[PDB]
Every structure is written in structure tokens, then in C-alpha cells.
Amino acid sequence: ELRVGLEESELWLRFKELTNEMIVTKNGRRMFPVLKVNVSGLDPNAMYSFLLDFVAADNHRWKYVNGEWVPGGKPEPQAPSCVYIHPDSPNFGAHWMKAPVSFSKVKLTNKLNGGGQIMLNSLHKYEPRIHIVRVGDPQRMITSHCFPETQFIAVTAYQNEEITALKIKYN
Ligand SMILES: CC(=O)Nc1ccc(-c2csc(N)n2)cc1
Ligand SMILES: CC(=O)Nc1ccc(-c2csc(N)n2)cc1
């Protein structure tokens, strides 16, 4: 059976317990932690591409008030449907399964200025999602998984000083 397991789940949950935050900038910022997954149950002989996108979690934005995240108003129109293609794509099942698949180079941005970045709305919550697309398939088979441990709020600057400190501690 296909299994796509979050790596460093305990590390992600340390961030989630605080409410995780990811910086978005004009030129784009790499994530910490990095999204990494282990894969079993692909056809080792088949070819697949791995995609990453971010699902909007709420019908509202968030705000950090008196050290707490609370509902912060009506949402901005949904960020454009941006997909990040893992640079090892396309590749054999055996490639994806031999070692964890890391999305170390994806950049999160608040400005459409190219460079395969992902645009997110500041103060909105997102859940990372990985897609596995089968190559050369007339049915264009795709399998999608979200990682609830990896939910975060996009921010232009860290709100929670405990997040600032955790980013420094573990990175
Ligand atoms: C930019 C873009 O085209 N994104 C995208 C579109 C469709 C899907 C999809 C369709 S059926 C399934 N499980 N996922 C995933 C990602
Ligand atoms: C059955 C089906 O809906 N297949 C599907 C959907 C979306 C994608 C996709 C979105 S962005 C990208 N590079 N590939 C691939 C395959």
C-alpha cells in the first residue's frame, strides 16, 4: 500500500504546539522546518513527479493578540493555485523510496516575481500537501496527502517570540 510518512514529525509538532509561522518575503524564503517525507508502496519500476502545494485552512485570517492567535477578520481572495515541482521529477519509484524526499528549495513569497516561488497571504493558515503524479499515464493518476502536523500561518515577520527562539534553536 502507498504510504507517505512525515519525517521529523516530533520537530513539526514542537512548532505546531506554539502555532507555527513561516516568513513570506518579496524574493521568497525557504521553510524551516523543511518538509521531508518517506515513501513506500510506489511501483519501483514506474516514473512519478512529486508536487507540493499549500491548502488554505480557514474562511478567515488570523491575528496575534495578547500572545494568542485569534480570528483576525475576513480572508483575502485565495492565493493563486501555485504548485512546486520537486526538482528530482520525473523519477523512478525506486528513487523516491530509497531515501526521504526533501522540499528544501521551495520559497514562500507575498509577491508574484517568478522563480518557482509559492505565493501565500500573510496572516492566513495553510496546510502543506504533496501530490504524486504517474508519468506516461493516459488516466494521469495522481495521489494527494496533507500533513496536519505541518500547518502554519504565513507572516511577514514572526509574531510569537517563542517561534523566533524555536527557529534559532533547531535551525
Ligand atoms: C496548479 C494546479 O494545477 N494544481 C493542482 C490541480 C489539481 C490537483 C488535483 C486534481 S485531482 C487531485 N487529487 N489533485 C492538484 C493540484
Ligand atoms: C486525474 C487528474 O486530475 N490528474 C492530475 C491533476 C493535476 C496534475 C497537475 C497539477 S499541476 C501539475 N504539474 N500536475 C496532474 C495530474
Q: Does any ligand 1 atom lie closer than 6 A to the CB of residue 55?
A: no
Q: Are strands 118-119 and 107-109 parallel, antiparallel or unpaired?
A: parallel
Q: Rounded distance, CA 90 to CA 51, Å?
A: 10
Backbone angles phi, psi at 20, to 5 degrees: -75, 150
Resolution (A): 1.4
Q: Rounded distance, CA 148 to CA 168, Å?
A: 23
Q: Which atom of ligand 2 is nearest to the CA of 140?
A: 4
Task: State the DSSP code for 150.
Answer: G
Q: Rounded distance, CA 93 to CA 144, Å?
A: 16
So what CATH class is 1-171? mainly beta
> What stretch of H or E contains 154?
strand 152-155
Q: Does any ligand 1 atom lie closer than 6 A to the CB of residue 141?
A: no
Q: For residue 140, what are the CA distances in angstroms to 129, 131, 132, 133, 135?
A: 18, 12, 10, 7, 7
